[PDB]
């Protein structure tokens, strides 16, 4: 029995990752990144990755919600606006189709003095009001919860963050260009911290993400069933140009002694409908590539058709994004209507604007977005989309794919698919019969003996990220100390390698030494004898270095 500390092996594990790099995803509570993207390729290591069971996604989701909520903490809560509104439509030169979208409403508003009221008005979108009992309306959210306005001074720009591992842990990265959602990745590397990932929130189309390698990739937990989303990643960008063409005037209304409401004062010029322009030729070519790949799973000779979204209200059935700070809900019908048989003319999608939103699809709370003065235009590149299959009859063909993606997590699964978090576990035991971090992981047990110091050195190594940092630091220290206490008891303190006075009990393994040390890696070795670790550890604590101290 010989003991080795600093052995380059690991087990899958879940822990807290730390963000590293005003916006709502404030970087105040964030660690600056080291400019050096330290990375070590693992020459002979094959690891199983699983995009669908990756808890890195879940932490990203909950951290984002927390940051979002904290950013609205100091903002004005609009409780005074739950009043009867008296109102009509707007008078202007309007697009004939865009009717009823805007209301011109007046109301009894409070002032900075308790004893005085004022009469004010603001324009509203139809989507944000409810007709109640001639011209009586109310804000839709007063039914369930008064809401805070977004602070006028914070940005919704999705500035990317990186997730870094704590001491004792590492992130493995899959470099296999053809890797689908799951299985053994033949080329594995390792990093201290992930690439920067933008917290872009959208639906039905994936915006500003990473692109695929030369082929469009299709990933699914179970391509066979229909209850799972199919994520499709483009190997090319598709450019979309969106706009909100009306010139709006912003008006500030005092609410109270330190509070103000941002009203829509008026509209300058003709009233036009918001819309997005998609390159038509690009979109068509792109779908042809998607179809080619989908046929690989549904038969060489088959038909693929696309259809628009199905029933739901708004947030469910339409595309969504934040452009310029406005919230757009677009009717992507012109993108998903085609049939693909076996063997500049931009597409224009109409789109609506809404000020009151139920972010993260939660209830009991919401956010009111203030109006933006002027005219909005922005561009983006979609890098993928979310599809669902409908069904069949077994006696026909032409599966239909429809857009979908109700969850938010699918937006981040798409980036984090290349990563996995593991825990580093030294104190390997092997018989002798009494370079880079993890660079030797793919090498033999014998060869690996030369990097024990490398591994050992990486084991100890207002604010949201408060308790999380203290907990991570404490844990790393406790793990370190527990290993040292054990080595101490065993009489191996201060030595990377030590020899016990216990001969190897062959009942634990029956191999020749030359068959171990020159053939197996430590990962393999641990797998063969992990069943007996506790036996050895137990015996070594009392048989020796306790009984021996009376001698």
């Amino acid at each position, epitope marked *: 029995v010989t003991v080795y500390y600093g052995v380059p092996v690991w087990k899958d594990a879940e822990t807290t990752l730390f963000c590293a790099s005003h916006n709502v995803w404030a970087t105040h509570a964030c660690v600056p990144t080291d400019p050096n993207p330290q990375e070590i390729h693992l020459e002979n290591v094959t690891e199983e990755f699983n995009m669908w069971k990756n808890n890195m996604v879940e932490q990203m989701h909950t951290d984002i919600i927390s940051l979002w909520d904290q950013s609205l903490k100091p903002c004005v809560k609009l409780t005074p606006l739950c009043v009867t509104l008296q109102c009509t439509n707007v008078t202007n030169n309007i697009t004939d189709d865009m009717r009823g979208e805007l209301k011109n409403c007046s109301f009894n508003m409070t002032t900075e003095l308790r004893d005085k009221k004022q009469k004010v008005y603001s324009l509203f979108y139809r989507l944000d009001v409810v007709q109640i009992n001639n011209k009586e309306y109310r804000l839709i959210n007063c039914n369930t919860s008064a809401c805070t306005q977004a602070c006028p001074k914070v940005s919704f720009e999705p500035i990317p963050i990186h997730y870094c591992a704590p001491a004792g842990f590492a992130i493995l990265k899959c470099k296999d260009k053809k890797f689908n959602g799951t299985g053994p990745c033949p080329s594995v590397s390792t990093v201290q911290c992930t690439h920067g990932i933008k917290p872009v929130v959208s639906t039905q189309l994936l915006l500003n993400g990473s692109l695929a390698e030369e082929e469009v990739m299709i990933r699914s937990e179970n391509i*066979t069933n*229909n209850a799972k989303n199919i994520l499709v990643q483009f190997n090319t960008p598709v450019q979309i140009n969106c706009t909100r063409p009306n010139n709006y005037t912003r008006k500030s209304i005092r609410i109270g002694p330190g509070q103000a409401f941002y009203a829509t004062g008026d509209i300058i010029g003709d009233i036009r409908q918001a819309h997005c322009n998609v390159s038509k030729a690009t979109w068509n070519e792109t779908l042809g590539k998607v179809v080619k790949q989908l046929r690989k799973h549904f038969g060489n000779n088959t038909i693929i058709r696309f259809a628009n979204s199905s029933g739901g209200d708004l947030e469910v059935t339409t595309h969504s994004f934040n452009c310029g700070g406005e919230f757009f809900y677009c009717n992507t019908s012109g993108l998903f209507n085609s049939t693909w048989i076996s063997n500049n003319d931009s597409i224009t999608l109409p789109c609506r604007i809404k000020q009151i939103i139920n972010m993260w699809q939660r209830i009991g709370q919401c956010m009111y977005a203030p109006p933006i003065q002027g005219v909005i235009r922005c561009v983006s590149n979609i890098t993928g989309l979310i599809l669902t299959r409908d069904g*069949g009859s*077994t006696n026909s063909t032409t599966e239909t794919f429809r857009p979908g993606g109700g969850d938010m997590r699918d937006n981040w699964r798409s980036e984090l698919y290349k990563y996995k978090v593991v825990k580093i576990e030294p104190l390997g035991v092997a018989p002798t019969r009494a370079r880079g971090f993890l660079g030797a992981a793919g090498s033999t047990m014998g060869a690996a003996s030369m990097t024990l110091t490398v591994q050992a050195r990486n084991l100890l190594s207002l604010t949201v990220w408060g308790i999380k940092q203290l907990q991570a630091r404490v844990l790393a220290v406790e793990r370190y100390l527990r290993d040292q206490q054990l080595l101490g008891i065993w009489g191996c303190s201060g030595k990377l390698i030590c020899t016990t006075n216990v001969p190897w009990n062959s009942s634990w393994s029956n191999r020749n030494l030359s068959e171990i040390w020159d053939n197996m890696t430590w990962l393999q070795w641990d797998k063969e004898i992990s069943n007996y670790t506790q036996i050895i550890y137990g015996l070594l604590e009392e048989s020796q270095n306790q009984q021996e101290k009376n001698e």
Partner: antibody
Amino acid sequence: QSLEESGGGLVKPGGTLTLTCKASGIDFTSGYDMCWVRQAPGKGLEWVACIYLGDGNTYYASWAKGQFTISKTSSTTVTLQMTSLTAADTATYFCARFAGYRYSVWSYPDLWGPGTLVT
Amino acid sequence: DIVMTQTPASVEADVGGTVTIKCQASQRIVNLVAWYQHKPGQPPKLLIIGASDLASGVPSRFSGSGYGTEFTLTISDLECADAATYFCQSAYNGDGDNAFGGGTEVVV
């Protein structure tokens, strides 16, 4: 084109009856299962147990898992052994065939027998 | 692991009228609903494939739609011949398995 079934009737509690289901001729080596469905006397339908008409893997309702067993017996028939029937098992039992959709795991019943009673 | 439920346990209309049946699912199902017509003394007859296509052999009286968590069946131009119990089901084989609704009755 049709399913026929029998072997029910009254057995005193704790006894066993076996139901059989006979096809008039169906494809027993393809993307179909054959499955027992129970109609409690006054309720809608309950799932009992299915067998793939292929490899022969079986699935059992959890309530039926420790009591009922099924197996393919021939190229025309499949049977259900209702081990230890009791008062609670009084019902019309039906034989049905299920199809898939295209490439799926979601099934689609498409053929039913007339059903038979046990007490 | 799911229950399909139906609300309009019993409906009645005169001949030529229209009734609807609403089936609520416990989880997101894309469109996988069968809708069988069942008369006593008879095996159930399939009306719908995929919650909206019609089964071969039924009149264009039967129609329906939905896209998860809720599906409906509409029966127009009712005749006494249509009096029956109507089913709702998801039919999955595996862990989250087969489920049927209570069934509703249409009287004409």
